[PDB]
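Complex record, two chains
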Amino acid sequence: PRDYNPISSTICHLTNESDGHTTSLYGIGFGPFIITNKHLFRRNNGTLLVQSLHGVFKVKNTTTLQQHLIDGRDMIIIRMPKDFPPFPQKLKFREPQREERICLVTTNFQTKSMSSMVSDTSCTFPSSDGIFWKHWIQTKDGQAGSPLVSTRDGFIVGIHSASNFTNTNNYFTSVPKNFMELLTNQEAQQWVSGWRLNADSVLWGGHKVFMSKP
Amino acid sequence: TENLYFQSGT
């Protein structure tokens, strides 16, 4: 059986606290970066609580956090502060392929305990563009950002993003082409900051997506 | 395509 701990051990729980509101979800640590959902920044005027197996790190001002936005996708790369303990760089990413067999790798943090698991294997296919890919692995609210991994080679091919109103269809955001290069080539990095959304609804990958279930 | 909602937490 494949060992997914090398993946689950890099998962971080993120809590964006701004203007009296909070958005919480998961991310994937890699070197000085944290890969996570773009909607984490529905707001960007507060603090970012980052929890991983290394401990709890808090960013005091999110507005100065350097970010790399992935065109058209619910994915963003965050460059953590210089004094943020770096994650390993063994993780592998790639675009989902036709006939991918996938599983969801998750991690959960409690006050006196913690746990991680890998779901059973299931199938998936592109929704229109391929920005979002449909899947049916059970996902609870709050698990956005959790990695979807290929059963074939252990590569991460996307991060969970959303579900339809009846939770019968789930959707993950696919890793874009040349993603690995993006992580290991500063020249390919487009660092910006202060970016935030202004609406409770967005139109990405051919779907209208709300920040929360109406 | 059906409308969706991000499964981020509170």
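Note: The radius of gyration of chain B is 9 Å.
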